[model samples]
Target: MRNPFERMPTVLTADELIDKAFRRAEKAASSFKPRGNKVKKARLREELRVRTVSNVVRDNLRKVLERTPGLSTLPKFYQELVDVLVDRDTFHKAMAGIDWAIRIIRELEERYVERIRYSNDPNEIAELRRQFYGRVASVLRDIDDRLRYLNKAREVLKDLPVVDLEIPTVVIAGHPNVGKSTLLKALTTAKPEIASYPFTTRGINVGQFEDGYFRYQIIDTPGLLDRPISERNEIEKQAILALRYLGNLIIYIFDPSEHCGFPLEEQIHLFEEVHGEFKDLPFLVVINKIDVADEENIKRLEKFVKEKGLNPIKISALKGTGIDLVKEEIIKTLRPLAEKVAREKIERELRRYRSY
Candidate 1:
């Protein structure tokens, strides 16, 4: 999903808010006069200052409140991702605090304006203006932590990759340095978008391609989805679980060169580990860097792989060898799967309509 927070207005902190409000108030009071009885001139100037400053603060604060999407209401993949980056509980409470501050500003504007109008003492009216300004600052400063957290969240979210949930998704996962990125680049016009993912220091990469009317999203998460099964933490596990909604097929790439820095045995081990875990999901097990591969090791892997009810294809993405088979495999799978999923959706809607 695309970031909902992309165009959010700048969020000001406690000190900035106070400074901006009072600074702008000084300018307004210098040139401005409100129409009223001459006796009320002093109170009127202070009233205008207070109202002008408060309006600026409230307007900006309201933008923050309105732009943020509800954490729990997003798609499961996005909700889980956001929760991992910033805890949902903390995020929700922070937004609620911002909302409360917005209402409080309205209250202070009403309460203090009336109090200023009732008093004739210039000193007292000025003092009430001070009190109103103080309240505005207090409301803003109280959410200092929340404001900071949200800004940090925005930085993280804006860098997030946009994945289409409506399209067919094929997660190309395996150990790093497998030329997974190479294959992705070869297949599509889309250069992979690198993004920070949970539980991974290096982040993740996603690529996209289109064939005729069909669109596909390919995920190549380096430290998160592409690593060993046992090495994963709960957050990574949640990431994988959430992706079950998007993944119609999987492509587990095998780097047989051993030059990718891991042994051939481990490649097969990772392939099996992922394969065993996701039994319901269909996939293609392919040996990459075929030109540099050890023929002996690959021969051993073949019998072993077929024994597990999976066939392994061989290809080199850099040399542009056997990539057509990869494309063919995906396109072949795409048609039947798309039709089946569509059929299921129709059946579900029909069921609901009949029940209604």
Candidate 2:
């Protein structure tokens, strides 16, 4: 009998070969590169550069959303589209192009996969080849999802009403010289006094960030020491007052490097005190200033948090490490609170129309 392996064709058609080559090339070119010189080939180079950048960004963003537990099933295309539009630079014009590209890619992937699925010869060998093609089509589908989600997110954000109500506020509290200003700067456009000193921020500064359909405000309060309640000063009192009143989410920023002469026991005691006060509220324990903290210190801190059954996030605010993760976590944690605030605002507006 003839060998089954010998029956497979050695050479492929030009179209087939091109498709295979393109898949490989596309994967390789999915990384971003800096712009080259603006010469006769400027437009071509720019186009290539953008295609690569867009592919890489879309792929990475999709992975992030996919791993986002609860947010995985949300309209992926819309979310990614909004992220691209809102986060990208105005000059890029990439967001608009991405919108169209996504639609076309979706159509192409669907048509190609459907054709392969319903092909006449469904032999085992042929089916394997089709599966390979299906993977290529899947990548295209992912690209579509990324671009579409980003655009939709942007549209939703644009149409969202500005939050006018001044109700429960969330304060970002932490230790001094822990890069609280950096976190503040990232969330809002407000320019706060950022310095390397222990107490650069004298008073509480408020800012807001809109998350698509909702608006959440952030208050950056002056840093306090990890000490007994009696040692708190006037500035600390003001910070505590802000926390007590509008403390929907108390973002406790701590610096492992500088525990303010307090031993591990005292530090834990201070945190426990604050945690006790805000037991019903959401508390985000941020291990800030990770850049300067040694590995041993970070490990010790992590052990401490685990031992106490505390959910803490590690970040290097100066280097921007874990910033995105922190932002996403904050949004996830405060989403319910944000929705409640939005509902209350709507109710307040409706009350004006009622003639009682």
Candidate 3:
């Protein structure tokens, strides 16, 4: 299992790791050529040299395996994110391949150390050392693909968004250019506006803001959450689900004006679909381009709002008008629900503990 709680540490590629290990071994060979009787010195110097190389190579390989996360042990949200970004099975197999190399190297070290121990001839010891190097190189070369995978995994996983579930968050989703990004810009301060959050596969723009003791996170997910959840693949499902996991509420942005490409009805349908998808979570349906919402558009949405016993939060994202109303509604709605969940969770745990 990996330490998924924090950022994944740097990992070395198979070649880089191999090259470093061999280079260290070569330096070790040159570092001490303990002069004495050729036979005795050969046994001590070459035996120690091989041991040094073996230890270095094994240590480096082991570090990669340890640094890489084991998916089964990860938080479900992270597990799904990896599943979408990269093949979790492929990652697991790569680590297995690494383990395979480490095992063989350990065996090789034992095999050569014993062989060197009995040999009295300096020439024989040298030959044995050469064979060890040959086998070690072969082991490393065999895992070249696995090494490549680890590096790729590192690069991919490292870029994943560092979403802390404890913080209050709001996720914005709508059709492309529906003022989702504009809303994020308006909501979060410039101080902590993270330009492109690496977590979402397509780099959704994300930002953080503070409203009293509750620091709020606002995400402008461009690709994954912009459409209906059913329309997305399992990976996309996972990414959005991860956001849902963090967010206290979801804001489905609508552009009643057709300037955003997708029409009002389509946006409304997508919002409806999303609302059903996340029925357990709190949500807000807001028309972002209300400043441009013509009479026909307002007539189109008035029924949906009235039927749901919900008022669509109206905002003009371009002018940053009515931004405060959205924030006020979110705080009013999200906090109480969150507190209720927390209370119920604590009570549930207490019940379990009392039973025990």
- The per-residue C-alpha lDDT of model 3 at residue 347 equals 89
Pairs of colliding residues, candidate 3: 161-199
Kindly report which residue stretches of model 1 are placed more than 4 angstroms away from their true locations once superposed: 1-3, 36-38, 72-74, 120-123, 162-166, 189-206, 233-246, 255-265, 276-280, 289-321, 336-356
Q: Model 3: per-residue lDDT, tens digit, 1-356?
A: 22362444455665676678778877876778577886787688778867887898888778766755578867566776677677778878888988999999999999999999889877888999989988888888898877877777777665556665555678888889898888887888754344334334457666776665455667777766677788766665766766655566888887878799987788878878777777777778787788887868876776777687667877899897899999888778667655665577688899989895
Could you give candidate 1's per-residue lDDT for residues 1-356 as a string of tens digits?
56766776667887887788889989988897667776588788888887887888887778888777776667677887777767778888888888888888888998999999899887788899999988888889899888888888777777554667656778787888988778877777667777556666866567777776566777775765566767777766776655666677888887767888888888878887777777788988778888988788778777887887777788998998988898888888886766675677689899989894
TM-score list, all predictions: 0.78, 0.46, 0.77
- Please report the candidate that would top lDDT against the real structure: 1
- Model 1 TM-score, all chains together: 0.78
What is the lDDT, from 0 to 100, of the residue 8 in candidate 3? Answer: 48
- Top candidate on TM-score is 1
Full ranking by TM-score: 1, 3, 2
The lDDT per prediction is 0.78, 0.51, 0.75
| lDDT of candidate 3 at residue 136, scale 0 to 100 | 86
Error of 3 at 172 (Å): 1.1
Stretches of candidate 3 off by over 4 Å are 1-23, 30-37, 66-77, 121-127, 162-165, 191-202, 228-242, 257-261, 306-311, 318-321, 336-356
Q: After the best TM-score superposition of candidate 3, give how far the Cα of residue 133 lies from its true spot, in angstroms.
A: 2.2
